[PDB]
Design a protein around this ligand. Structure first.
Ligand SMILES: CCCCCCCCCCCCCCCCCC(=O)OC[C@H](COP(=O)([O-])OC[C@H](O)COP(=O)([O-])OC[C@H](COC(=O)CCCCCCCCCCCCCCCCC)OC(=O)CCCCCCCCCCCCCCCCC)OC(=O)CCCCCCCCCCCCCCCCC
Ligand SMILES: CCCCCCCCCCCCCCCCCC(=O)OC[C@H](COP(=O)([O-])OCC[N+](C)(C)C)OC(=O)CCCCCCCCCCCCCCCCC
Ligand SMILES: CCCCCCCCCCCCCCCCCC(=O)OC[C@H](COP(=O)([O-])OCC[N+](C)(C)C)OC(=O)CCCCCCCCCCCCCCCCC
Ligand SMILES: CCCCCCCCCCCCCCCCCC(=O)OC[C@H](COP(=O)(O)OCCN)OC(=O)CCCCCCCCCCCCCCCCC
Ligand SMILES: CCCCCCCCCCCCCCCCCC(=O)OC[C@H](COP(=O)(O)OCCN)OC(=O)CCCCCCCCCCCCCCCCC
Ligand SMILES: CCCCCCCCCCCCCCCCCC(=O)OC[C@H](COP(=O)(O)OCCN)OC(=O)CCCCCCCCCCCCCCCCC
Ligand SMILES: CCCCCCCCCCCCCCCCCC(=O)OC[C@H](COP(=O)(O)OCCN)OC(=O)CCCCCCCCCCCCCCCCC
Ligand SMILES: CCCCCCCCCCCCCCCCCC(=O)OC[C@H](COP(=O)(O)OCCN)OC(=O)CCCCCCCCCCCCCCCCC
Lengths: 606, 459, 177, 128, 155, 37
């Protein structure tokens, strides 16, 4: 007990110490990014011990160490839930963040505000581990809004750029729309169960949990870029490459998925919520992987890749397999962070070029980036016995062999083929073929920061699926008996995707020119949704906000009814009183009329 | 409460007998000492309110408003000493006297044991505010704004006088402590309907209610910075304080008299946030944000659950600090570009990085970032309005989305993008300005550590 | 249409802008360099066919339906250069383009850190404030009545005189500060 | 032939497809020359003040002050209460208030009827 | 700034229209005000309702972030048509065709999720069987009551 | 056609002044002159 809780809190306090260091500074640092990278490496080391002694026994505890507030029956405490989810996500996120920061010491080197960048990146890590370790909804909301605000600050990093500010405000918009449902869930649990703690939620175990689970699905739609609230994540590639690699691939965008996995004892008892999650996840993994097929910016292709994998995670939550979904989070982190790091290595080596149509021939000019990008693409598509296999193969073999929405399953398999298609699109245009970049070759991947940072996630992408799948305990009963066309579904559909896209990419060398079909313009313009809605909804909101609200109500009508009409009425009565002609005859004639009215008409003499 | 009234009156000879270069430093120092002394009011008990005399008492509602009021005076002196630097010495002492006198009225407004003393002090707070706006306001519209500020409040409050003297003749007393035990139910009649309106409409104007808020984006804009600070931080909260006192007497008629005003405020928090999305004046954007935040406090008082009162008093204190800091940031740019147009000075993070950090933190507290007491008050009001009706979560969430939108739109517009080329008098941030920003923000962040002293009488 | 020097676009300029847009969008459609080179020679032939056209009405009509051709056959996400508007690195470094007058507001302890730079800056500021009145009276004697017709600026004519309105063109920030 | 581009309010017509761009007539040449002359005179008037060594302040734009005074301070003197403004002030002013009033009144009457019948499950509700 | 440089009421005579067109620094023939329906525009020009994104990004603007010049009459909704906000630029696909394809795709996907919900897939198995009367005490059953015996047999 | 002779002369003079400015933007070998730590 004493070792587990101590190293648990020492991990988080160790991560907060460089924030005190960057705030209590006078000098220019002796390499503060090296200090934060060393701190996160040592925090990974510190977090490995409670993980090992969870793998030994299954040891879990709650650390409710600080009573913060008591609202008459709601004792709010700083409470840390050290369960399977925290024990398997904290070292994965620390290992990935350690590799992202050693990548960042190379990528963000010429930036004169590199200390602010590492401060912001560590603040994201602190808020994310506040999110994933929280035991009540208030502290989880703190980590939730914290990763939202650090998402803002890291998307709009180059704040002179209009598109960065626009994409950051977009991300805040979609995440606050998800926060509507998050606060709906908090309100429901407080009113109907008198708690925000997960323990009383799980022990009271409500049956009419349709509405709070709808709120949690809305929160995960906002946070994990599901359909309807998806377009902030491809816009979120406007920030720097380590921002994308850490936050918007592996660590931040799995938080809504982590929220719905965190409420697995309530989603396991609600078939309506499982069907909603299944249809939403299949919709997302179809639509975003369909958008990724005809994109040209490499970071957009990998952002639609990670939103397709988030749709797949929402699918496997929807089939009552939450631990497979969390395994796929911890699996997806390694190779998707490494895919963004390889793409950023290409971007730096080709002088800030992010377009795959100006690449090629990097199979030999960038051999290590090529090796790791091929390995990450194979782990993304579900090559056998890499890290992506031990999650994605089980997700497909469990979504097939279950009482399932059949259209959701069929769109899941079409998405599985599309993953292979856009992965070999990345490999074809970025690596293979002939060079299309400009003529001054400054290709160089010879920094040990870059080599080591890709190397550790490369060892992760080779072995982490095997290691984690053999170290996690059984939490469900795995379906291991199925017919052979149904066992071989994912591999056959992935090979058909590779063959189909080999045909597609080899028909790009032919001397034919074809006008683009409507399916090409649909898939290339993001399914028209960031074009239609981002023009139409701000139009109807801001025209209303000016014309109705600012002008017509609160400069015209609410000013007209009470103050202006009363002022004009008292003005007019003032002019009727004092428009006398100064004639004594008329004043005494009015006095006579007064006395006549008082006698005859008002009976004041009676 | 006399140990706070007497030093505030002794600030008058302290500001009139000071040396001509010492009249800011002495008033700042001794008002900081009064603000240090204000913490003795935290002697609160779970059963009894801290009842001083026949005239003064302080429960856990009036105590945070008192500490915020006594804390606001040195910060108003710091904010207002740069643009009144070239002023006459006598007019400078008159400005400081109006600030000290407004604090003197407020600290015995919140502690008024008897309600007509509350009314006299409550309407006494108009006169120094009116003199500050119409005398040391900058543009032409300050006279019209003083007219609107005076004649909405008195139009609302002169029925309140007749209502309170009626309660004095009926119950025999307007002592709030006696009326905690002699309160009778107020049944349904037209007489009691207009009783409810006469007791509530003055405070609805002071909050302000949506539809009656038209005094506010002219009084808060056309005031100087000390006027804007006190109007945003204390003088809107006089209305919520009076509501939380006077709704003791208005039961059970409030349970159906509240519906039109709950509709007005639940729709006004949407409409005024939408107005904030399309403001060209930065100071007016902060004014309509204040209307949008006080709409929730109106809903929380009118639904009168304990969670709603706790969230309303937390949101009143949090909004006082946040809106005062937003007006001070707006003044820090107005003292450089000499225009309140928000689109004029752009890209200011490239020029003033630490001042842009203060902009970031005040915009984060404006959007209710947890665990700030902004989010605590916001969240408790949302809990209580959800328990009121489950469909109010749509309006509360849509308000939170638009609130985040105009907060970060304000931040991006003033601080981000390419800087304005033809503006070259952007000085570095003075130590006075950064100290003002930190003395707003650091108590607002430290109150997240121990938030129980701002959750009212029924924490 | 919209130019600082001219009031309009000529027909020849519209044809050249169409030809450049068509080659760029074709290069977006025709990613590989040999295939783009083939179809770009075909497009050069399609522009060289109606090249020696002396009927301005016929050339205007061919230009208009060629714009309809280009609009029907444009790439939806064309290749944009990174520092080109729309590109992924456009206006990225504008947050590092601090203007020159911000050096005037430095404390003297950090002006003492760069003595030769500020000592060499004072002669630039001196040169500008002696050039200013001469370049103002240069502009007012050359500009006709009713104000200038175009946004073109005249160069310096004497020796020793600097070109008029030169300061915020010369002392603009770099592209990679 | 080719599908004609149909312009919308939020997707305008391109310059390359607009039929009025290709005008060579002398009235369009004089209009564009006069617009270039106005823009050039305003450009000169700006950048004479902008390049001044003696100026240290704000080159004030009267167009910006004119825009803000149109947006706020001149709206009500240019207002006439007529059919269009009164119907838009009644529809957009008291319409949503009446709407949310009947919505929340219906919902709360339903909730109170279920509570006083013991039908609304209120077992663990003690925070309110 | 002074009185005759501020906006005024709606122009009715052509010399008032010419004075207003001189005031807003633009041609008399290009000056159109908003129509006098009393909404409160005065003499302010109705500019052609374009976003600032459509402005020439290569032209040397006086405000390069805004793509706007000094002295140029601003649009009424200039705060709305900034490049951080509503874009009106010409789209490669028509607006109505975009709306039809997006609405048809979303409606078809929702209709097919409803069909697949109505016709779900499954596996040719029975229900999962559990000991101890379908786990009566494990599922929170009270021990004072006795459940009906749920007996499962070998096959 | 290309530039006018006035435009080429102005670009030449602005180019010379710009290159003088950018050459003056270099550091000295003694700069930054630091205070003693
Ligand atoms: C009673 C004892 C209490 C002791 C502990 C105190 C607790 C916190 C108090 C307040 C802390 C913030 C104040 C400093 C920041 C503001 C000024 C600033 O910009 O400085 C930068 C400057 C260093 O930057 P620089 O590069 O030199 O210049 C600035 C740059 O130009 C440009 O700047 P920049 O943009 O690069 O950097 C700004 C950066 C920008 O980053 C952000 O804005 C991101 C922040 C939001 C997202 C992440 C946080 C989300 C919430 C989670 C954390 C809270 C809960 C955690 C618990 C677990 C979960 C329940 O912000 C920060 O780094 C702030 C770090 C701390 C964040 C706290 C939350 C602020 C967010 C808004 C409110 C949120 C809710 C309230 C939370 C209250 C918690 C107590 O800092 C300093 O020099 C420090 C000066 C001294 C600060 C003292 C603070 C305490 C004073 C209290 C006095 C009385 C009590 C005695 C105790 C004293 C202890 C020291
Ligand atoms: C580098 C500085 C560190 C300290 C170095 C010097 C000391 C050396 C080491 C010895 C440690 C100090 C002695 C022991 C510590 C004190 C023990 C003790 O009983 O303390 C009393 C208590 C313990 O709790 P408690 O339950 O006894 O008291 C709470 C108080 N009442 C009951 C009145 C409500 O307080 C602390 O320990 C304070 C530390 C808090 C740590 C967490 C801070 C969170 C910051 C964010 C706030 C907002 C969160 C909001 C959301 C929360 C979730 C809903
Ligand atoms: C912000 C501007 C608007 C402010 C609005 C303020 C509230 C609106 C309603 C105010 C009504 C007047 C005060 C009522 C005090 C009630 C005291 C009392 O005992 O009531 C019960 C008494 C009952 O009579 P009684 O007390 O003699 O009898 C004993 C009680 N019974 C009947 C049971 C035996 O009510 C009245 O006598 C009349 C109350 C209504 C008075 C209507 C006249 C005023 C109309 C509205 C004017 C609003 C402001 C207009 C101007 C705005 C600026 C230009
Ligand atoms: C891993 C399993 C690999 C073996 C199974 C797939 C074999 C197959 O069907 O290969 C067909 C095809 C290559 O053959 P084809 O494209 O017809 O010929 C052109 C010559 N390159 O296509 C391929 O071989 C490409 C598919 C490889 C998939 C690897 C990742 C899964
Ligand atoms: C909720 C309450 C709503 C009503 C609040 C009171 C009215 C609005 C505020 C006061 C008037 C503001 C105003 O614009 O007044 C100016 C107008 C013209 O008067 P003038 O003297 O020409 O203007 C000042 C010189 N430039 O002045 C006038 O037209 C005269 C205004 C007189 C206001 C008296 C209010 C009396 C209230 C009780 C009525 C019985
Ligand atoms: C826009 C400017 C800013 C906003 C300013 C404030 C606006 C709202 C202020 C007034 C609020 C509405 C009046 C009170 C509503 C609460 C319930 C009520 O009394 O409804 C009106 C009444 C409904 O009938 P009922 O209540 O059953 O009648 C028995 C009463 N003992 O209805 C009737 O009996 C019929 C109508 C009676 C007369 C209504 C008008 C006079 C009373 C209000 C003043
Ligand atoms: C109704 C209607 O058409 O009113 C128009 C009338 C002016 O009539 P006119 O068009 O001048 O002939 O205008 C009038 O009669 C004056 C205004 C009529 C009532 C307007 C009601 C809505 C006011 C805004 C409420 C905001 C809350
Ligand atoms: C289980 C349920 C699942 C349900 C899923 C679906 C639910 C939601 C349905 C869609 C609603 C949200 C989407 C519409 C608004 C999108 C706004 C946005 O993203 O704006 C971005 C836009 C710029 O974007 P872009 O065009 O990409 O920029 C490229 C470079 N110029 O930026 C701008 O133009 C700036 C805009 C600033 C002002 C924003 C005004 C609009 C605010 C909308 C509020 C919506 C509130 C919804 C409340 C719901 C309550 C239940």
């Amino acid at each position: 007990m004493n070792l587990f809780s101590s190293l648990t809190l020492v991990t988080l306090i160790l991560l907060t110490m460089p924030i005190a260091a960057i705030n209590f500074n006078t000098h220019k640092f002796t390499n503060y990014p090296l200090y934060v990278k060393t701190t996160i490496s040592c925090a990974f080391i510190t977090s490995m011990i409670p993980t090992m002694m969870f793998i030994h026994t299954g040891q879990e505890m709650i650390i409710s160490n600080w009573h913060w507030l008591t609202i008459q029956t709601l004792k709010l405490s700083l409470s840390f839930k050290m369960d399977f989810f925290s024990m398997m996500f904290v070292p994965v996120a620390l290992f990935v963040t350690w590799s992202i920061m050693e990548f960042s010491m190379w990528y963000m080197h010429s930036d004169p505000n590199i200390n602010q960048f590492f401060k912001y990146l560590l603040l994201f890590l602190i808020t994310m581990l506040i999110l994933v370790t929280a035991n009540n909804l208030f502290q989880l909301f703190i980590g939730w809004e914290g990763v939202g605000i650090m998402s803002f600050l890291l998307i709009g990093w180059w704040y002179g750029r209009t598109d960065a500010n626009t994409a950051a405000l977009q991300a805040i918009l979609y995440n606050r729309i998800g926060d509507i449902g998050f606060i709906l869930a908090m309100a429901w649990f407080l009113i109907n169960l008198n708690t925000w703690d997960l323990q009383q939620i799980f022990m009271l175990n409500p049956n009419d949990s349709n509405l709070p689970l709808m709120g949690l699905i809305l929160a995960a739609t906002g946070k994990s870029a599901q359909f309807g609230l998806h377009p902030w994540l491809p816009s979120a590639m406007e920030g720097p490459t380590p921002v994308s690699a850490l936050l918007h691939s592996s660590t931040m965008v799995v938080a809504g998925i982590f929220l719905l996995i965190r409420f697995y004892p309530l989603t396991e008892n609600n078939k309506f919520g499982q069907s909603i999650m299944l249809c939403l996840g299949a919709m997302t993994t179809l639509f975003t992987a369909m958008c990724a097929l005809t994109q040209n910016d490499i970071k957009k292709i990998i952002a639609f890749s990670t939103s397709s994998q988030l749709g797949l995670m929402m699918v496997t939550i929807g089939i009552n397999q939450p631990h497979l979904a969390f395994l796929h989070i911890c699996t997806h982190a390694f190779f998707k962070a490494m895919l963004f790091m390889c793409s950023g290595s290409i971007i730096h080596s080709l002088n800030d070029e992010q377009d795959i149509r100006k690449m090629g021939g990097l199979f030999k000019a960038m051999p290590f980036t090529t090796t790791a990008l091929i390995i990450g693409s194979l782990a993304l598509t579900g090559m056998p016995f890499l890290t992506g296999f031990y999650s994605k193969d089980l997700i497909i073999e469990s979504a097939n062999t279950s009482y399932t929405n059949a259209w959701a399953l069929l769109m899941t398999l079409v998405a599985t083929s599309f993953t292979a298609i856009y992965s070999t699109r990345i490999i074809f245009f970025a690596l293979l073929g002939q060079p299309r970049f400009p003529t001054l070759i400054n290709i160089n991947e010879n920094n040990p920061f870059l080599i080591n940072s890709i190397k550790r996630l490369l060892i992760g992408s080779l072995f982490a699926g095997f290691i984690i799948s053999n170290n996690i305990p059984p939490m469900t009963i795995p379906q291991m008996t199925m017919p052979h066309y149904l066992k071989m579904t994912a591999l056959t559909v992935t090979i058909l995707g590779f063959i189909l896209a080999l045909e597609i990419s080899n028909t790009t060398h032919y001397l034919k020119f074809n006008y683009p079909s409507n399916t090409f313009k649909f898939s290339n313009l993001l399914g028209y949704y960031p074009t239609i809605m981002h023009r139409l909804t701000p139009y109807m909101n801001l025209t209303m906000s000016q014309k109705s609200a600012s002008s017509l109500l609160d400069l015209i009508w609410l000013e007209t009814i009470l103050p202006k009409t009363i002022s004009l009425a008292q003005m007019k009565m003032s002019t009727t009183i004092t428009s006398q002609k100064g004639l004594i005859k008329l004043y005494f004639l009015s006095f006579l009329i007064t006395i006549l009215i008082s006698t005859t008409l008002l009976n004041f003499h009676e | 409460m006399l140990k706070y009234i007497i030093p505030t009156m002794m600030l008058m000879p302290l500001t009139w007998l000071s040396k001509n270069s010492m009249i800011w430093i002495n008033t700042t120092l001794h008002s900081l000492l009064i603000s240090l002394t204000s913490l003795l009011l935290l002697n609160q008990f779970g059963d009894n309110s801290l009842n001083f005399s026949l005239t003064f008492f302080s429960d856990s509602l009036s105590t945070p408003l008192l500490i915020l009021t006594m804390w606001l005076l040195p910060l108003m002196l710091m904010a207002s000493q740069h643009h009144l630097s070239k002023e006459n010495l006598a007019r400078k002492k008159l400005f400081i006297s109006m600030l000290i006198l407004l604090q003197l009225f407020l600290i015995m407004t919140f502690t008024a044991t008897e309600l007509i003393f509350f009314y006299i002090m409550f309407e006494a707070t108009l006169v120094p505010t009116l003199i500050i706006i119409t005398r040391w306001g900058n543009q032409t519209e300050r006279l019209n704004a003083g007219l609107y500020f005076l004649f909405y409040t008195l139009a609302g409050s002169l029925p309140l006088l007749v209502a309170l003297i009626y309660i004095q003749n009926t119950m025999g007393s307007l002592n709030f402590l006696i009326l905690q035990y002699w309160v009778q139910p107020m049944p349904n009649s037209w007489s009691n309907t207009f009783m409810w309106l006469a007791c509530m409409m003055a405070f609805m104007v002071k909050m302000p209610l949506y539809g009656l808020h038209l005094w506010l984006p002219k009084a808060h804009v056309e005031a100087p910075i000390a006027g804007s600070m006190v109007l945003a931080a204390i003088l809107l909260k006089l209305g919520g304080y009076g509501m939380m006192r006077i709704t003791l007497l208005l039961n059970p008629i409030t349970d159906f008299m509240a519906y039109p005003f709950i509709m007005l405020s639940l729709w006004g928090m949407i409409m005024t946030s939408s107005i904030c999305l399309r403001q060209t004046d930065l100071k007016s954007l902060i004014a309509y944000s204040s209307v949008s935040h006080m709409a929730l406090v109106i809903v929380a008082i009118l639904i009168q659950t304990p969670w709603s009162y706790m969230g309303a008093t937390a949101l009143m204190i949090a909004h006082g600090l946040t809106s005062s800091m937003l007006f001070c940031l707006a003044n820090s740019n107005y003292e450089r570009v000499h225009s309140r147009t928000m689109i004029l000075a752009r890209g200011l993070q490239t020029l003033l990085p630490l001042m842009a950090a203060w902009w970031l933190l005040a915009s984060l507290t404006n959007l209710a970032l947890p665990p700030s007491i902004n989010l605590i008050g916001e969240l408790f009001v949302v809990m209580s309005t959800f328990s009121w009706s489950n469909i109010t979560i749509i309006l509360m969430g849509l308000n939170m989305v638009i609130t985040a939108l105009y907060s970060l739109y304000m931040l991006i517009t003033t601080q981000r993008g390419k800087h304005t080329h033809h503006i070259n008098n952007i000085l570095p941030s003075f130590t006075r300005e950064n100290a003002l920003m930190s003395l707003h923000m650091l108590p607002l962040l430290l109150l997240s550590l121990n938030p129980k002293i701002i959750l009212g009488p029924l924490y | 249409a919209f130019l600082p020097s001219a009031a309009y676009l000529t027909h020849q300029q519209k044809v050249l802008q169409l030809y450049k847009r068509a080659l760029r969008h074709l290069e977006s459609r025709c990613v590989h360099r040999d295939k783009y080179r083939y179809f770009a020679c075909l497009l050069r032939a399609r522009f060289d066919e109606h090249k020696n056209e002396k009927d301005m009405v016929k050339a205007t009509q061919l230009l208009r339906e060629a714009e309809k051709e280009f609009w029907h056959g444009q790439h939806p996400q064309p290749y944009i250069f990174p520092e080109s508007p729309g590109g992924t690195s456009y206006e990225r470094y504008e947050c590092y383009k601090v203007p020159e007058w911000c050096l005037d507001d430095w404390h003297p302890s950090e002006k003492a850190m760069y003595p030769d730079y500020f000592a060499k800056r004072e002669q630039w500021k001196k040169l500008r404030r002696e050039s200013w009145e001469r370049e103002v009276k240069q502009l007012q004697e050359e500009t006709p009545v009713g104000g200038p017709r175009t946004e073109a600026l005249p160069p310096a004519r004497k020796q020793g005189d600097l070109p008029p309105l030169w300061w915020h063109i010369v002392t603009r920030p770099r592209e990679r500060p | 032939s080719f599908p004609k581009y149909e312009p919308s309010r939020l997707a305008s017509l391109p310059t390359t497809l607009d039929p009025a761009e290709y005008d060579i007539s002398s009235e369009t040449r004089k209009a564009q020359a006069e617009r270039l002359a106005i823009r050039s005179r305003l450009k000169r008037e700006y950048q004479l003040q902008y390049n001044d060594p003696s100026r240290r302040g704000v080159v004030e734009d009267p167009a910006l002050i004119r825009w803000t005074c149109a947006r706020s301070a001149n709206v009500y003197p240019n207002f006439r209460p007529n059919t269009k403004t009164s119907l838009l002030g009644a529809l957009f002013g008291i319409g949503p208030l009446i709407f949310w009033y009947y919505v929340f009144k219906t919902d709360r009457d339903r909730k109170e009827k279920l509570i006083q019948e013991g039908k609304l499950d209120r077992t663990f509700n003690i925070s309110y | 700034i002074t009185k005759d440089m501020l906006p005024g009421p709606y122009p009715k005579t052509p010399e008032e229209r010419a004075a207003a067109a001189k005031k807003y620094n633009m041609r008399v023939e290009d000056y159109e005000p908003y129509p006098d329906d009393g909404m409160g525009y005065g003499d302010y020009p109705k500019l052609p309702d374009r976003s600032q994104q459509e402005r020439d990004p290569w032209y040397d603007w006086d405000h390069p972030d805004l793509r706007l010049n000094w002295g140029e009459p601003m649009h009424w909704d200039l705060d709305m048509y900034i490049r951080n906000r509503v874009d009106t630029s010409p789209t490669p696909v028509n607006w109505n065709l975009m709306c039809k394809h997006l609405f048809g795709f979303v409606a078809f996907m929702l209709f097919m999720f409803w069909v697949g919900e109505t016709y779900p897939t499954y596996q040719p198995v029975g229900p999962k069987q559990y000991p101890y009367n379908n786990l009566y005490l494990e599922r929170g059953g009270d021990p004072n009551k006795e459940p009906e015996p749920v007996v499962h047999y070998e096959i | 056609s290309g530039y006018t002779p006035d435009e080429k002369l102005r670009l030449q003079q602005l180019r010379e002044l710009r290159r003088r400015w950018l050459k003056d933007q270099e550091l000295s070998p003694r700069e930054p002159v630091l205070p003693p730590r």
